[PDB]
């Protein structure tokens, strides 16, 4: 998916971001080594599905932070666009106060590198990436423009990947916190999981 490959280092970047406090700051991906990161792109500030998603992630950021996971949004719009978007009322299609940084991918190269840039329109698809504390890409989700993502699904996936790293077990279809795992071995899988 662009240069973004599962079990490869997530494409690095360093770019100006609108921060929670309203200020501008260069954020790099490497600066998150040690934590999980949910990087989500959306197409355009001031539009339709985009506000719902950004607000949803920002409002639920604590759910991610409790799990050693940071949240980053990104679009091709400027930091000044982002700022005004947060200064605009949610009832008017605005973001309001934000609890997550938003990158200004003004060169579009970040989205290009994640393979989610629609080149003819110059905007990102709804691509979301789960990156581990080693900097490794683990999960890709990309939606077409008119269909929003699911905060609940992304959290489910984060819990699963964490369960794997902690227990050296694998998570079956539909796993939620507290479901049993399976040992990825012929005999033990049958003994521990399949026979029940």
**Is 68 within 8 Å of 35 (Cβ atoms)?**
yes
Q: Which of 20, 65, 99, 139 binds its own copies (CB under 8 A)?
A: 139
Catalytic residue, candidates 1, 50, 69, 74: 50
Other CB atoms closer than 10 Å to residue 28's CB: what's the count?
Answer: 12
Q: Give the nearest distance from C-beta 79 to its own copies in angstroms.
A: 9
Nearer to its own copies among residue 35 and residue 46 (C-beta): 46
Give Cβ neighbours of residue 37 (< 8 Å, ≥ 6 apart).
10, 29, 69, 70, 71, 72, 130, 131
Taking a C-beta distance cutoff of 8 angstroms, is the pair 76, 111 a contact?
yes
From the list 28-36, 66-74, 120-128, the region that binds its own copies by CB under 8 A is 120-128
Query: Which one of 29-37, 62-70, 152-160 is the stretch in contact with its own copies (CB under 8 A)?
Result: 152-160
Q: Count residues contacting its own copies (CB under 8 A)?
A: 76
Task: Please say if 50 is a catalytic residue.
Answer: yes
**Binding to its own copies in span 10-49, by CB under 8 A:** 44-49
How many Å apart are CA 83 and CA 176, to the nearest integer? 36
């Amino acid at each position: 998916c662009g240069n973004a490959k599962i079990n490869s280092p997530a494409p690095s970047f360093e770019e100006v971001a609108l921060m929670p406090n309203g200020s501008f700051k260069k954020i790099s991906l490497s600066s998150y080594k040690g934590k999980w990161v949910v990087l989500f792109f959306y197409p355009l500030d001031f539009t339709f599905v985009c506000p719902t998603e950004v607000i949803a992630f920002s409002d639920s950021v604590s759910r991610f932070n409790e799990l050693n996971c940071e949240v980053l949004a990104c679009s091709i719009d400027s930091e000044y666009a982002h700022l005004q978007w947060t200064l605009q009322d949610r009832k008017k299609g605005g973001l309001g106060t934000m609890a997550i940084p938003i990158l200004a991918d003004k060169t579009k190269n970040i989205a290009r590198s994640y393979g989610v840039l629609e080149e003819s329109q110059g905007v990102a698809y709804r691509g979301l990436f789960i990156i581990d504390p080693h900097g490794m890409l683990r999960q890709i989700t990309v939606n077409d423009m008119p269909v929003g993502r699911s905060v609940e699904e992304v959290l489910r996936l984060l819990e699963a990947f964490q369960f794997v790293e902690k227990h050296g077990e694998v998570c079956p279809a539909n796993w939620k916190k507290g479901d049993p795992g399976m040992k990825p071995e012929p005999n033990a899988s049958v003994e521990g999981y399949f026979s029940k």
